[PDB]
Design an enzyme around this catalytic site. Sequence first.
Site, PDB file in Angstrom:
ATOM      1  N   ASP A  11       3.855  -5.801  -0.146  1.00 45.66           N
ATOM      2  CA  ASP A  11       3.590  -6.179   1.234  1.00 45.66           C
ATOM      3  C   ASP A  11       4.212  -5.137   2.151  1.00 45.66           C
ATOM      4  O   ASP A  11       5.421  -4.883   2.084  1.00 45.66           O
ATOM      5  CB  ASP A  11       4.165  -7.561   1.510  1.00 45.66           C
ATOM      6  CG  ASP A  11       3.896  -8.518   0.386  1.00 45.66           C
ATOM      7  OD1 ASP A  11       2.751  -8.990   0.296  1.00 45.66           O
ATOM      8  OD2 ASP A  11       4.807  -8.755  -0.436  1.00 45.66           O
ATOM      9  N   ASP A 130      -8.185 -17.553  -0.371  1.00 47.30           N
ATOM     10  CA  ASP A 130      -6.981 -18.345  -0.155  1.00 47.30           C
ATOM     11  C   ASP A 130      -7.356 -19.818  -0.115  1.00 47.30           C
ATOM     12  O   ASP A 130      -8.056 -20.257   0.805  1.00 47.30           O
ATOM     13  CB  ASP A 130      -6.279 -17.930   1.137  1.00 47.30           C
ATOM     14  CG  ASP A 130      -5.614 -16.576   1.022  1.00 47.30           C
ATOM     15  OD1 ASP A 130      -5.280 -16.181  -0.108  1.00 47.30           O
ATOM     16  OD2 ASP A 130      -5.436 -15.884   2.036  1.00 47.30           O
TER      17      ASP A 130
END
Lengths: 253, 200
Positions: A11, A130
Amino acid sequence: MLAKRIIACLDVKDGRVVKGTNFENLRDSGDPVELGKFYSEIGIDELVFLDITAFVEKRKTMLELVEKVAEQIDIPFTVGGGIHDFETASELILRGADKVSINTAAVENPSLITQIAQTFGSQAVVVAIDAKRVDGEFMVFTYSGKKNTGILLRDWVVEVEKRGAGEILLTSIDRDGTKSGYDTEMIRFVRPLTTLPIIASGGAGKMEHFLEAFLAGADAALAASVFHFREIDVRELKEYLKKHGVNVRLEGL
Amino acid sequence: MRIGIISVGPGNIMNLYRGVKRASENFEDVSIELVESPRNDLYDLLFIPGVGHFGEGMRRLRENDLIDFVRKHVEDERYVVGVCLGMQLLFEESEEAPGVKGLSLIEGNVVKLRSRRLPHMGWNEVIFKDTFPNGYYYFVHTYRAVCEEEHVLGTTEYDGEIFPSAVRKGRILGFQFHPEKSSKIGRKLLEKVIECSLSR
């Protein structure tokens, strides 16, 4: 046969590893490039970079990241995070990325999956999905899990395979950040809806969670914190799975 | 030793250029050049990279005057190496583009694979007959070589189907996988290619 994969997720924001690592041995363990190089050395099979810079300069920031990572990385890597249209996908691949991850822009425009695949091949397209249980049904959320699209996950995976997606990155919103195990029930639910390879994602806490997720039908296991802060040794993990029947890639030393 | 890599063909080739660059860090007599046009001449090791349509690439060596420059590398007993599409060239023809004659440096043609899960993508085991290291390398390709069990150098199996991931006809090597995307063993593969090329 084809190797089950272990994948490290990085990330990034502003060219640096968001919440850093804990790998004492690099100098600048927030350099996504040197951390990537390292993860290849111990035997990670693929890397995904997910960027959360600010929308104005996010695009130049990602292109700077891909270039810097391509000059030095000897394994496949994917980039993703706010990739909203074909142009803003074609440039990252030609800049050097092996694959693009598309998420909300794929829900709000299935056509982009085919558009990306059409001039790069399905192999260059990762659709990040997701999902979260809503009233006993798996549903697709967008805007980093803030918007219930109202779309059944079960439908969305057949559409993306249809549209030409190459790989699905399946994150159980219920289990991201929990360290209690992968959402194997959601992996098993998705497994027979598609022949696309599935990257399980969300909830890695210990080695056995990887075994669990592979018994569930995953083709690849994504994780970040467990690796970045040395809770799990990649090689230990791979040797663990090789011991219990998972066909991972494990070379001799 | 000077190594040259055809920088023209379709798809990304700078990933091979590094990684070959990376692999020759251990050699003194070594230098690596991006080959843009037939002018410069000649290299001991010549790489043919590329990924894409068989027709393109046949079209790009072609307008850039490199078919003849390759024709002369193989002749003068130099190591010529085609990687990915570069391996699928080298032969007579592809069903990926009927008509175009290829390089025809090894006897054979090119067919689609017989699997309903394409492309062949990921890490797969490669067994070499000799010389180059065994183990998992990384693959992305929808087409496959057809040659006689003589030019075969390394074999791999995807979805039931055995096929040659490496070829060797004397000093012409071909490799279907991406050695530049195969972590440690991929440098070893490329290092051993370089070590083979000092022996002429």
